[PDB]
Design a binder for these strands. Structure first.
Lengths: 98, 70, 57
RNA sequence: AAUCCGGUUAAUAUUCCGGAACCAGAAGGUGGAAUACGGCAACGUAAAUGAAGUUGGAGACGUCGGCGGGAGCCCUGGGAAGAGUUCUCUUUUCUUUUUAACAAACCAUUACCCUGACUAGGGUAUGGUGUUUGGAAGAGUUCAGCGCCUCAUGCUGAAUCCGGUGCGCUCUCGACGGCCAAAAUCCAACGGAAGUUUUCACAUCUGGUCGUACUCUCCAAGGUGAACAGCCUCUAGUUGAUAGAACAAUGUAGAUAAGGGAAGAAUGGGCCCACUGUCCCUAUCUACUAUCUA
């Protein structure tokens, strides 16, 4: 139902995080009902192209949770100073540099 | 502040000298609110039909001060 | 030198307490000449002076 | 009798600014009706003569307790935004998320009237308490971006949402239970003197004098703790009262001390028992004073 789009064009251009790395991080950290990879059919994560990640969920999907999940990868990569997550639009999250 | 739902009354109100100026505010709901400030009350008429609002603006008295959206 | 009347003024437009302000320690020259509220409003939009967020309940 | 919002200063706001209303008083003008009405009823409408004289209501009323209604604070869930934590765990943690004055229609805890001979069926009024809208997003608040030698201090986007909870706290109103001011001012009635109507609506005007800056009985978060005891934090406000420097005696104070336990802390208990620097016999420590320097 609800569609969540995360823009990774800036990350791909700056090579901060690859689309596959984002997809692998998203797959390994998708705590659907507290279980990783438990998205099932209600929530489907399908990144169309290596510039963005799209998630279609039939249930509630918090953007802050996705941002919090995205913040862990940035903290792990230590790119928080040079890259910040921004709310481009309702349900749209993008990465912004300094 | 007295909202008026009668188009003819608003035209008659504009016809009388009691009216001072008329402001047409464009709302997000695409409804034209024709607000005319009189001596004792503020006459506001909200028209959803753009053509009706366009006709009302065209038919407004020349003496009235037509104001765009603030 | 004396920033007292300028910070106290800044807190008033800051709507919080006099101790709820903060600046860097190396811009004393350009804040000293800001006397009116319009000067401060220009400075807060610049961000040279700024509050700090509340820390916990 | 009658006003609120937002913004504005070096020092001002219900006063100033911008916007929006209300009151009182005043005349004439327009239009409306006018030469008052329906319901057994309580009562209702756009108006709908009233002299002298007579009457009433409000103003204008003691105190306490419990209950209901609402509001706000606080608490809490979801959404949005921002920040913080993280290999690890934490959809996490923290902060914020607005709608006045007044103007339009909607709605009883109570009482009255009709049917009934309390229960029960139909109406009646106050609608503080809400059901939308104007005011009113155009304002304010928070994010993201831009404008640029410049006092350019603007400009562009958005969001500014869905809720719930109360031996909580505050206040307000209302139905009960009891315990036992006056004056200013306003309205209405009876009344029937007189032979276009204004208490209907809209347009019109104006609203003097004085205090108003500033310093000090009212305003009063949460948690921990059983508690308004005690602490902590938040909000906010100080780091100010002459200091520095060293630590002997003296003096203040707080402690600990072997063995005895009134020979001079115990929990205190029932002369007895317990207890202890009261004493034998003082010793040690800390802090301050004392001491020096300015």
């Amino acid at each position: 139902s609800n569609k969540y789009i995360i823009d990774a064009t800036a990350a791909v251009n700056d090579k901060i995080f690859d689309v596959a790395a984002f997809e692998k991080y998203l797959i390994d950290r998708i705590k659907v009902d507290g279980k990783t990879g438990n998205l099932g059919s209600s929530v489907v994560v399908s990144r169309e192209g290596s510039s963005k990640i799209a998630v279609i969920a039939h249930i509630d999907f918090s953007g802050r949770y996705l941002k919090y999940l995205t913040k862990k990868f940035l903290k792990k990569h230590s790119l928080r100073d040079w890259l910040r997550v921004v709310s481009t639009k309702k349900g749209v999250y993008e990465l912004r540099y300094y | 502040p007295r909202q008026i739902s009668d188009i003819k009354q608003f035209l008659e109100i504009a016809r009388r000298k009691d009216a001072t100026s008329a402001r047409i505010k464009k709302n997000t709901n695409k409804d034209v609110k024709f607000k005319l400030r009189c001596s004792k009350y503020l006459y506001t008429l909200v028209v959803a039909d753009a053509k009706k609002a366009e006709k009302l603006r065209q038919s407004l008295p020349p003496d009235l001060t037509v104001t765009e959206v603030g | 030198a004396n920033l007292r009347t300028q910070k106290r003024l800044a807190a008033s437009v800051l709507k919080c307490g006099k101790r709820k302000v903060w600046m860097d320690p190396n811009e004393i020259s350009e804040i000293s000449n800001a006397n009116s509220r319009q000067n401060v409003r220009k400075l807060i939009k610049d961000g040279l002076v700024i509050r700090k967020p509340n820390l916990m309940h």
